Design a binder for this molecule. Structure first.
Ligand SMILES: [Cu+2]
Ligand SMILES: [Cu+2]
Ligand SMILES: [Cu+2]
Ligand SMILES: [Cu+2]
Ligand SMILES: [Cu+2]
Ligand SMILES: [Cu+2]
Ligand SMILES: [Cu+2]
Ligand SMILES: [Cu+2]
Lengths: 477, 476
């Protein structure tokens, strides 16, 4: 009835129309057990402050069933742990670079001061050296993530294995009816694509200016992953951590995915679907129900046609199903009037640009006063004809916005919540309601990592009127 | 608005008795509060879950000297948290490793009587063991396990046998509550004993009107201290005394929000700074430590003696979640004559039900399962002060509603389901009772020395579509 059974974005511009597209290959290895990221432990709690330490470091990981792979990871050989943050708490972080080149810690999703706490290009930690930052957190319940933002080297470092999941909990809008037992009924899905060259990742080998694609899907750094379900309800926190690849998530048994959340948090109401497309950097939290299944059944989840995660059903321990409310979260959406900001995304490959300009680190491209609600007009000037086009996902640092309209029409069924990343189809005009809460220099860019690297970034000053600020910007790219 | 008084009639409180024993705050180090381990499942196959529980002997360091000789379930003393879920089948194995006969009464669980009931008819001999099956179909609530032989229940409870039982129903559970067992969700199993050379001797302390100890335990811990690491704390309080009433207070009159009673949640939450509990009663309360500083102690006391100290540490999370105004929907509209009468009478030796002592081979009442019948439990002890005692009526295999007390509305926290109810002298408490499973169930005074003496009786919960012949024997 009201069940989606399709993929929302315009198909004529999907990634697989590209001339140098790489199809995924289901690799020949044993079914590995799905790796769950460990929960990051606190060094200490002192007042409302919580002390964390995170090392960027090199290591070997047995991913295939042969040699190991040379990986980069946070507090480990590859990927990183679950980092919990709580709304209304102060956090002290220690960023230790144990890698042999400069990196940053961009907290994609966290609304914290820019451009240092933010973790964008401006804040660099040198090999050997480390960095300290403080910040308060004040935002809704949502799933975020951590990745490197060094310029122009992000893509390479993400490819090298740097990324981590970030859970943010707000006591005043959290839904404790949902599965929350991390590792058991509440799981991340960090989808990425890589190509192994003798059980080894070589970014230089696979590079494409329009975005680098791998031929082998990973999931939490696991290949041919299998997760055993021991409870009826499963909460998946899906994240497209690819450089370029779109994630068209489906199943052969068309199991209903009820989506409770997006990049910015819970949605007004739940949305039932059997498919879901995710562009880069976009998260979705979905519930699955295994009640009407028998023990031993496999529910294979596929990206397009290739299997990436298998959900095997065991004997259930308890029944973790709890009736939800109809409204998951209250959200004002009544906003009108002309756009005060315009972002024309244009080009492909070499040509990629924003408002005709490439990233310059010493330039402020826009300004907006914190607190106010201003409307944006993000557009894509790619050819609409099928295969002519391309889907760029706009990301904005230090904020969560609302999608107001797409070419005048209502946004897709699952976009009535807060987001920080949004797919723009060719020829489209997406209207966004943006509000900055903390001031500072923030980024906005295409989250296809090879585009950002090649200069699809721009900077905005979130202005506090009661604290005009002088900036000493340098370019380190 | 805020209740600040104990509910029951004071003229009949335990401390009017001629041979009352005052509690003594003992001189020992502040011990860390013991949290019962969660019982592991042997296996799961289908909707069935397999448990095994040993009754067994052991030594426990309770004081800071010698150890004490204790009895316990899967351990030296007390027992673990036993989780049950509504809408599941359970297979249990009861292994008696004690040197005398015991049972496994699941006080609170609505399961068939009188075998799976764990009542007197279900003895397990020393060395031998027993198997039982049963489905669970009841609301979210806290129950407990204790032995119920004839007439040795009191001695065996005193010896250390008891355990907390959590029962969860997915369709009426409130996941807003603290549920992280051991962290923000803990039991409070209040008991009183007297140590004779760091040793329990029931024969020494015995009083037919109920045995009293001079030393409060809490989860078998003396001078317990629990460190709070989260703003909201869920206490599951249980009076596991033989006789002693539990007048729970605090010197700093912290507000206790009472979410639940013996049969589970209340229609709405009730705020109070005090709460009285008679034997076998349970109450789940929330405390809020937001407006406190680190290092503060919130001492809970039974009467004038401290039993637990809640030290405030650095908080890890904020676990406070808005509750709804109605915690649970409950029909209370029920009228018409009582079809059942229980006259509780006597004290000490005289104690009796409807003029009769417990006889194990006799059916004292009958009631058809499914139907809602009204009961009239009364106390004919003198109303005049110091001349009366409060007997708590318990009924096996059912959860009832308190409809009225001497015609008046029941106390502020009695609008939910209970299985135990205090009856003041001269009182007439009207109860709405329904049996869901048939069999031979007990109803009795849960002052354990009264039950042993015989303040007990038996009812046949009759299934009309399965009349049964009973071969009842006295296993006393
Ligand atoms: Cu990002
Ligand atoms: Cu970002
Ligand atoms: Cu792009
Ligand atoms: Cu960025
Ligand atoms: Cu009992
Ligand atoms: Cu009972
Ligand atoms: Cu009595
Ligand atoms: Cu009983």
């Amino acid at each position: 009835m009201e069940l989606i059974k399709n993929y929302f974005f315009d198909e004529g511009a999907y990634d697989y129309h590209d001339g140098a597209y790489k199809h995924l290959i289901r690799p020949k290895t044993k079914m590995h057990k799905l790796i769950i990221p460990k929960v990051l432990k606190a060094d200490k709690i002192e007042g409302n402050t919580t002390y964390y330490t995170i090392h960027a470091q090199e290591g070997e990981t047995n991913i295939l069933d042969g040699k190991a792979t040379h990986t980069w990871g946070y507090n480990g050989s590859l990927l990183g742990p679950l980092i919990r943050y709580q709304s209304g708490r102060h956090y002290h972080l220690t960023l230790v670079n144990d890698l042999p080149e400069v990196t940053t810690w961009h907290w994609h999703g966290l609304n914290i001061p820019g451009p240092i706490e933010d973790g964008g290009p401006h804040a660099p930690v040198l090999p050997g050296k480390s960095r300290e930052i403080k910040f308060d957190v004040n935002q809704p319940t949502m799933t975020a993530w951590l990745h490197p933002h060094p310029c122009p080297h992000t893509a390479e470092q993400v490819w090298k294995g740097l990324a981590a999941p970030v859970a943010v909990v707000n006591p005043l809008d959290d839904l404790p009816q949902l599965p929350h037992t991390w590792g058991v009924d509440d799981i991340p899905l960090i989808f990425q694509d890589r190509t192994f060259h003798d059980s080894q990742w070589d970014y230089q080998a696979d590079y494409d200016m329009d975005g680098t694609l791998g031929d082998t899907a990973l999931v939490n750094g696991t290949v041919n992953a299998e997760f055993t379900v021991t409870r009826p309800c499963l909460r998946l926190r899906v994240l497209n951590g690819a450089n370029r690849r779109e994630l068209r998530l489906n199943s052969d048994q068309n199991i209903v995915m009820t989506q409770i959340a997006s990049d910015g948090g819970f949605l007004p109401h739940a949305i039932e679907m059997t498919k879901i497309m995710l562009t880069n950097a976009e998260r979705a939290e979905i519930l699955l129900d295994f009640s009407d299944y028998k023990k031993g059944d496999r529910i294979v989840l596929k990206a397009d046609d290739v299997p990436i995660l298998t959900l095997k059903v065991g004997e259930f321990t308890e029944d973790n199903r709890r009736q939800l409310p109809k409204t998951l979260k209250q959200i004002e959406r009544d906003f009108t009037g002309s756009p005060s900001h315009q972002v024309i995304m244009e080009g492909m490959d070499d040509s990629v640009r924003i408002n005709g300009k490439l990233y310059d680190m010493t330039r402020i491209d826009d300004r907006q006063e914190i607190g106010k609600n201003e409307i944006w007009d993000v557009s894509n000037t790619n050819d609409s004809m099928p295969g002519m086009g391309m889907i760029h996902p706009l990301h904005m640092h230090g904020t969560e916005f609302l999608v107001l309209s797409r070419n005048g029409k209502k946004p897709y069924p699952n976009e009535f919540g807060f987001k920080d990343t949004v797919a723009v189809n060719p020829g489209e005009h997406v209207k966004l309601l943006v509000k900055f809460n903390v001031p500072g220099i923030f980024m906005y860019h295409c989250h296809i990592l090879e585009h950002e690297d090649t200069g699809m970034m721009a900077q905005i000053e979130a202005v506090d009127p009661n604290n005009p600020q002088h900036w000493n910007l340098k370019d380190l790219c």
